[PDB]
Amino acid sequence: RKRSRKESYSIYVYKVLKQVHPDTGISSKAMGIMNSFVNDIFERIAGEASRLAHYNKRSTITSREIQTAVRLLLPGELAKHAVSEGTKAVTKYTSA
Amino acid sequence: KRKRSRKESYSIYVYKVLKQVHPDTGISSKAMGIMNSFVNDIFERIAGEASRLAHYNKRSTITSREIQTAVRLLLPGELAKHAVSEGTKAVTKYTSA
Amino acid sequence: RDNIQGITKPAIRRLARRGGVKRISGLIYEETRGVLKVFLENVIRDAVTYTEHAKRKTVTAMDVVYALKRQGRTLYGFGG
Amino acid sequence: KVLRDNIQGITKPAIRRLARRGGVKRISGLIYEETRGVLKVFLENVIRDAVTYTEHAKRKTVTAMDVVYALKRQGRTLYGFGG
Amino acid sequence: GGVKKPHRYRPGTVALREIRRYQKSTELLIRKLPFQRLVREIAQDFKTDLRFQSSAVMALQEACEAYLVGLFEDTNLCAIHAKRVTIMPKDIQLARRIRGERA
Amino acid sequence: KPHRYRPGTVALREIRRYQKSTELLIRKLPFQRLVREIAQDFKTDLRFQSSAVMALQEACEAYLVGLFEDTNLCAIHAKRVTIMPKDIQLARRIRGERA
Amino acid sequence: LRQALMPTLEALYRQDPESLPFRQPVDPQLLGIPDYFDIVKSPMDLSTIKRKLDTGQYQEPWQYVDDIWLMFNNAWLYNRKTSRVYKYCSKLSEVFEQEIDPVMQSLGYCCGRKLEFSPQTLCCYGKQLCTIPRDATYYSYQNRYHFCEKCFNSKRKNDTLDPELFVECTECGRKMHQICVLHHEIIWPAGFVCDGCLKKSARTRKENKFSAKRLPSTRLGTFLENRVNDFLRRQNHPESGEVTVRVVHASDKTVEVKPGMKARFVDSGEMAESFPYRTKALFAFEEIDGVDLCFFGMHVQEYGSDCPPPNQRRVYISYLDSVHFFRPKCLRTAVYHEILIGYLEYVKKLGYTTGHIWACPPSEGDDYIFHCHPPDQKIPKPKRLQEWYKKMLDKAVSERIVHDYKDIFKQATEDRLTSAKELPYFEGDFWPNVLEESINDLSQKLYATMEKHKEVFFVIRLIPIVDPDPLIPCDLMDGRDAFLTLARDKHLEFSSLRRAQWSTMCMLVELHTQSQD
Amino acid sequence: AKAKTRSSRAGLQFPVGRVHRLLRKGNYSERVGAGAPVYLAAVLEYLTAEILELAGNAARDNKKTRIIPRHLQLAIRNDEELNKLLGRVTIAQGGVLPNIQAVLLPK
Amino acid sequence: AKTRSSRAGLQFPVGRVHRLLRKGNYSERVGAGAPVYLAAVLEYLTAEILELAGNAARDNKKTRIIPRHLQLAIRNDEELNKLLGRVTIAQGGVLPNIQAVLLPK
DNA sequence: ACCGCCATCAATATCCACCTGCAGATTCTACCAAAAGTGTATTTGGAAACTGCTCCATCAAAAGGCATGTTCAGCTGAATTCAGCTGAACATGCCTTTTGATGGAGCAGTTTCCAAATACACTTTTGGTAGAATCTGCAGGTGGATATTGATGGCGGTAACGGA
DNA sequence: TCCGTTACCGCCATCAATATCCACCTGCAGATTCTACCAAAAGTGTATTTGGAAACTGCTCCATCAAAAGGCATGTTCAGCTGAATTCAGCTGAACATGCCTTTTGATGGAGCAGTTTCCAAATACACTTTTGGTAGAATCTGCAGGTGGATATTGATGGCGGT
């Protein structure tokens, strides 16, 4: 009715900002800017992964496709950090 | 037997559509590549706007309304309306017959 | 009503001052007003089409944002 | 084998003809190296997209399809070779 | 004879000061009511009896304000390139032409 | 005695001639050697098809052709006939490729 | 009248939203301005004129034009300057100005523009010489006298503008502007005939016996006009007309030295008491569209061979004035240079060796000779006058007429003058006033002051005296003051081409009448 | 009927089942409407009609009976609507339009 | 009993990413670890943006994040300059810049 | 002797017509793997009909901005000149084209097999709307201390001048 | 022609009005904390199919050697020109004062916006049959490119008729 689901990234962005800077605040608009930014980036990555996966007649999309999309969209200096962090995260997840 | 995989193209449809306007004008194989690339680009784009408007309306059913809106949004100027007209009449006759 | 005189001389002068302009010619305003009008018409048509698609009689910032994103002018802040 | 210094292979008559095709009447003698430097970033970007496409497919042969679909997303869609 | 000239600034001196002051400010510049009237009048052509929310009008105002600043910044380089100080319309026309929106 | 055509009159000849022709004006062998050695940096022992190099050539030739008239109009804007690299930099920056 | 004047009214109507306030009669009760009837005595609008002309209540279109100008004047008087209604009325009047002219031209009239003369300066008895400036309050005296308010310790303002006169043709009966048709009572006592009536009957206007060419001729004027005609023929300009230069005044006078120099030198007997001289005044006329127009005039002072030293064998240019109406425009400077060079050559042939030029630009609102200078005529800068004189002198030297020209400082240094006695003395010159204000200290002060102003003054080296030209006594133009007063009193302005031509023909008529009563 | 296909039912030369199969295999959605392909085929055929019409007159005026990429480039570049629609499209063997400025002329 | 975020140590709701991918209809079948990688990349990017915003705010003697600080942080980094080459920041203004040739003498 | 404009002549380059050789376009013959229309059963999102409920649209005060009038000086445009720059032509020698042959790692097809996504059931938690209480950095207000532009004059540098 | 005299021009010096800077005080709303509450979502378990992978074999086409050559790349010389510097001459927006106005903020009356329930018509799935569109194979016809001859615009050079 009046309390319909309107999930956002309000708590997550705040709690992430807590570690990097404890004595820092984000009043009203920074949340909207970051939400629009993350939505746009997610849309670009998902669309690129989808089209590149379709370009190979593959019915299953794995982390390799989205990784290729990230390397494609993000040039080398961010690409190496992205691939390193992704490999470390996936190895930690699989090991656990 | 062992034979290579087949390929798909719209050669016959293009050859037919050239005949009605210019029976004497010939067409070479060079321009077919450009024409196919252009028509595929138009098709994928218009499907993109159609699906995007469908997502905006959250409609689980894809119908003529969102592709109509995509035609209005994408093609600039009265040319859009042009296509609309024929497209409209097409679907109407497709409903009639 | 013409409603095009709303872009006054001080407003356009202060807007041009942001670029570091020291001397402004006296006939720049008509063509920049025309450019503004033709640029706004393109997005207003898109917004009207988007609103008409949803069968809604009220326009929203959702339609404006997802109409501007197709022109390579994605806007941050109004997406939530 | 790893060769080098092929940018000088673009002969002066070739650049002169390119400038003439663009409607240039007078051509200065110091812009050829500037154009040679400018082409570097475009060539690197195109080869990077093409090699990313080739490496994603696990193939050892580079095809024109990878190049054309890589140029499509850059805003330089090309017609003539299907797609 | 006579007494005059308490303090008179050289031409162009106040321009730098006002540019510096305005470059550190981020408030709006266009009045809301004339923009609302213009938007309503333009929208009258397409459909009649339409209601518009304030947030959409603010978004359109921001979008139109950013584009003018971008074009002015683009034309500044063209103006300085031609070894000229005054701004001429041809700068604006050629900046529009190079951007590819004239096609 | 040589005819000694006045400067600027000859340019009309090739500006009229080249606009009526579309044949490629870049040699294929230096281009393929250049693209091979440039692409060798990312991956070694690569193999390229015949059509790929020509497709890349005809896709990269259009950029300069499309920039030429823009640079010409930028140079003419400065009340000059001669083109300068600053015209190319200005065109690239306004186009958004650089900034 | 309906079919001819309605295009202008429709053009006024379609100017949306300019004409909206004037579309309907003003209602003070429903507009918040109840005092309108107190300010405007005849409140009426466009619809009233439309109704009047639809019903044929206008005898002639002049009444319709007058009513339009009347509502424009009422709207201007009521609304303030910064009000939007004032701007609306102003631009509507401007548009009507271009719209009404073709209709009157096709109907056989001259023009349909409401033209008014310049505001006259008003004399006052506060200091016996005070002149009331334009738009100044004053106290009236039964409309026959006026007094200034500042020196005072009925009241009106100097905002009254004299309307242009009208003349009625003796055959067609139409009333039109006198200046536009260029008709004078003395020239044609039998009446005024419009061009349309003459064309219908294939008749021609009576030959003008008051033209400049019929004035008595002078040798200097003949030489000047011959030189101008020769130069113009060499140029061969298709738009060039016929130029006549004639000397109209030549009288002998004496200049009196001021008492400050009288005590220093005259009492000691080192210089003469007075210098006799002959003053000459000439004007330049050009025939444009069959009408004489004055475009150049000067006043000069020549010192004869019998003049006591150091004023021996010299000439001085007292004043210079001209109007920017010569055709062609490009050759006007060339014609002025030719006239000056011809005058210098004539005085050299007479024997004169030294010439003095004072390049003093006119002040704003101050006219040297031709009253009411056109607004489009920009006031030359002192630098501009110096450059013009330098170019004229270079051209004269190139013709082997002038040996050389210098500034006053270089001429004084070359002449090795020591005392102020050797300094040139002219009537109304700045140097006598400077010397009087100053009073070897005097010599040093004069040297410094004249070195400061050496750029303004120019000295020309050209190389008994007998004048073959007889004397022409004329008190109407004995000095620029009388000419200015006569031009102001008779409203003989030079603001427009038609007004300038009317002023020129009035001057020609006056000179002809005074020469022979 | 066993002989009247859907393509002949709508009076369109373009196929209607091929585009439907492409939409089904495109993974755009799990539900695909029946009325979309008939609308899309008409638009595609009509756009082909305009491109052919604009190529035909460019081919005729050159005293040529064979299609050349120059004719396509001329047809694209002389229309203010196609240029706006395809302003970021490069055509091989198309060239550029001749352009001579008045300033550069030897006046 | 144990959430996937706790197992992977990631702050973002990795379950919500998987749920979005399921209803996003990008593919009929998706991998289990792909949403983890996507969430990690998004977290890295947003952490970069947040730390740059914090540095920009600290470079202005202020303890509160404002859109001007966001614009200054974005426009001072060439990677963000090219990446957000078409993105407009609300109330961000422009970078101060004056040409040397425009200076007097 | 220069500067404009021009008739005449010899040499260039282009367009056109006639003729001939050849790769590309056109048409039988047929093919079974795949597509589509037809015949049934079933299920589910949306429309009609009623209701309760907010939010955009329409009037009133007082003073920091908005439009006019006046004056001017750095800014912009025009005429003149000179020397390093490129364009053209001729002679001489290297460079890409085409066709032939050969060797083998890469690509495509086939069968069977193993681990993971998915449809249900169950439970135990965790963040959003609600409330209240508390504090502290920040927007105005006032008060003194230095940095900046600039007209102006004391006096040195210097050019012009006149008598010796 | 050289030295004493003088006025003009310019370097640099303290200051006057204005602006910017920091320091202290005061009242207020958003951030922080705390409490309870509860439904949608996430955890495990079981069975099932299927998609990628293994080994094997056969087809393929690209780098390099090799040769004969005629046309274009490069060096050298000659000369016409067009951009940068100088000086001069006309003008419009910057910098003040003054009278007059309409932004901004303060509460309102009714038509769309949900909420809920039930029935309807199209979507999807399985099985059969005929058939149009790609294609292996082959034979046949022709418009287009090139060679050669002919005719015509076009341009520079030695003079020739007007102004200087």
Residue numbers in the entry:
A (entry chain H): 29 to 124
B (entry chain D): 28 to 124
C (entry chain B): 23 to 102
D (entry chain F): 20 to 102
E (entry chain A): 33 to 135
F (entry chain E): 37 to 135
G (entry chain K): 1054 to 1206, 1232 to 1517, 1578 to 1601, 1611 to 1664
H (entry chain C): 12 to 118
From the paper:
Here, we report cryogenic electron microscopy structures in which a p300/CREB-binding protein (CBP) multidomain monomer recognizes histone H4 N-terminal tail (NT) acetylation (ac) in a nucleosome and acetylates non-H4 histone NTs within the same nucleosome. p300/CBP not only recognized H4NTac via the bromodomain pocket responsible for reading, but also interacted with the DNA minor grooves via the outside of that pocket. This directed the catalytic center of p300/CBP to one of the non-H4 histone NTs. Representative writers of lysine acetylation (Kac) are E1A-binding protein p300 (EP300; KAT3B)8 and its homolog, CBP (KAT3A), which can transfer an acetyl group onto the NT lysine residue(s) for all four histones. That is, p300/CBP reads H4NTac at the bromodomain pocket, rotates in multiple directions, and rapidly writes NTac to non-H4 histones within the nucleosome independently of the DNA sequence.
We determined the complex structures in which HAT is directed toward H3NT (p300H3-I·H4acNuc) or H2ANT (p300H2A·H4acNuc). In all complexes, as in p300H2B·H4acNuc, bromodomain of p300BRPH bound to H4K12ac of H4NTac, but the position of binding to the nucleosome was different for each. In p300H3-I·H4acNuc and p300H3-II·H4acNuc, it interacted with the minor groove at SHL + 1. Importantly, in all structures except p300H2B·H4acNuc, HAT of p300BRPH interacted with DNA through one or two basic patches. Along with that, another basic patch (KN basic patch) interacted with the linker DNA in p300H3-I·H4acNuc, suggesting an acetylation mechanism for H3NT that is less dependent on pre-acetylation of H4NT. This interaction mechanism explains why H3NT closest to the linker DNA is more likely to be acetylated indiscriminately. In p300H3-I·H4acNuc, the density of H3NT toward HAT could be modeled for the C-terminal residues after G33 (leftmost panel). Since the distance between the substrate-binding pocket of HAT and G33 is ~21 Å, p300BRPH of this complex is assumed to acetylate from the N-terminal side of H3 up to K23.
